[PDB]
Amino acid sequence: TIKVFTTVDNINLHTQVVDMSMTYGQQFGPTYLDGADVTKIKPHNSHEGKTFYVLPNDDTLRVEAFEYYHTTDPSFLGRYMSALNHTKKWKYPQVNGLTSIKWADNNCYLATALLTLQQIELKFNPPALQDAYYRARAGEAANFCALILAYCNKTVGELGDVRETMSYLFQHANLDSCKRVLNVVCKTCGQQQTTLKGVEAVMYMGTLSYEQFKKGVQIPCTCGKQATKYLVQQESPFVMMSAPPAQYELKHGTFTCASEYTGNYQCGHYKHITSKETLYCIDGALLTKSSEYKGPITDVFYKENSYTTTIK
Ligand SMILES: Cc1ccc(OCCN(C)C)cc1C(=O)N[C@H](C)c1cc(-c2cnn(C)c2)cc(-c2cnn(C)c2)c1
Numbered sequence: 001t002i003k004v005f006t007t008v009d010n011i012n013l014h015t016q017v018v019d020m021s022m023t024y025g026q027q028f029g030p031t032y033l034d035g036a037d038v039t040k041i042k043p044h045n046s047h048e049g050k051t052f053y054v055l056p057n058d059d060t061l062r063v064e065a066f067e068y069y070h071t072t073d074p075s076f077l078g079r080y081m082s083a084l085n086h087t088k089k090w091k092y093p094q095v096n097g098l099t100s101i102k103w104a105d106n107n108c109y110l111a112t113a114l115l116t117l118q119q120i121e122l123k124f125n126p127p128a129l130q131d132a133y134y135r136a137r138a139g140e141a142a143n144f145c146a147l148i149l150a151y152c153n154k155t156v157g158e159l160g161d162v163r164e165t166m167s168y169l170f171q172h173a174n175l176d177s178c179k180r181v182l183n184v185v186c187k188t189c190g191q192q193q194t195t196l197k198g199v200e201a202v203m204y205m206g207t208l209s210y211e212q213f214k215k216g217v218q219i220p221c222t223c224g225k226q227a228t229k230y231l232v233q234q235e236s237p238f239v240m241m242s243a244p245p246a247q248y249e250l251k252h253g254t255f256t257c258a259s260e261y262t263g264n265y266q267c268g269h270y271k272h273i274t275s276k277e278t279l280y281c282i283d284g285a286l287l288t289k290s291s292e293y294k295g296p297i298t299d300v301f302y303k304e305n306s307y308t309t310t311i312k
Pocket residue numbers: 159160161162164244245261263264265266267268298
């Protein structure tokens with residue numbers, strides 16, 4: 001017999017002794033080692049003192065699994081470990097002092113989201129996400145990318161939308177303090193003030209210009225006469241302005257970062273534009289810079305702390 005360690009979070013470790021004739025799967029359930037499923041594999045001599053991830057099979061492991069991942073989904077572990085086997089192969093080069101991803105397995109939307117999270121203020125609720133968030137910024141983002149895929153129910157290779165991925169992640173972050181107050185003015189119906197919080201307070205779909213949202217955007221009213229909706233108050237460390245891909249001019253110093261989408265719907269390739277001393281363009285591992293930018297943009301991120309309008 002040899003002794004090993006089983007865990008769900010790797011924070012809490014549980015010591016176990018295993019028999020060499022019985023495979024790891026029948027004694028522990030579904031068992032993984034550094035990405036590789038060892039359910040069918042029998043214990044080898046090198047697997048002494050090794051740390052194994054196991055699907056929770058008692059109440060102690062179930063509670064520890066929730067405390068770290070904030071989910072009770074039994075499929076989460078498998079999907080996470082399956083993505084990790086690919087993300088560990090990916091290359092994460094440092095570009096403009098930011099951690100990117102060499103393009104692989106259609107990850108252009110993942111790198112764009114990873115680059116954006118390093119530039120906006122965010123605190124993740126699941127300790128698993130926050131701990132990988134920290135090490136991702138340090139340059140080792142394999143665990144973080146695998147977790148993003150699992151939490152988004154996306155698999156390797158699958159095409160991804162950056163706005164949808166950011167939304168999923170925002171629901172796992174503490175955006176409770178974020179508030180957005182809007183006013184829709186209609187000549188028939190009048191003035192109606194609505195208050196959004198959380199994900200809805202930091203995301204808008206319709207326009208890329210944060211200024212235009214402050215000025216007002218035409219949206220249909222219940223009566224049918226198009227009404228003006230404008231931003232009244234905003235309390236959030238950032239805002240995300242999204243709109244269907246269209247030609248847009250990005251000016252240096254007026255934004256934080258943006259998403260460039262090029263090609264057909266659901267099969268295009270994403271590029272990341274950041275504002276810095278000059279406009280930088282990050283396409284995976286490649287970097288180009290220019291003073292101005294005009295191209296197909298679908299998401300623009302802006303900085304914010306507090307904002308109160310002047311319209312009466
Ligand atoms: C790359 C990708 C992967 C997955 C994905 O999932 C979607 C399915 N979800 C589960 C509903 C979507 C996408 C994608 O194309 N996104 C990009 C950002 C995208 C492109 C276009 C678009 C329009 N014309 N042309 C040539 C492209 C239009 C939109 C858009 C969004 N809202 N409106 C009202 C329009 C967005």
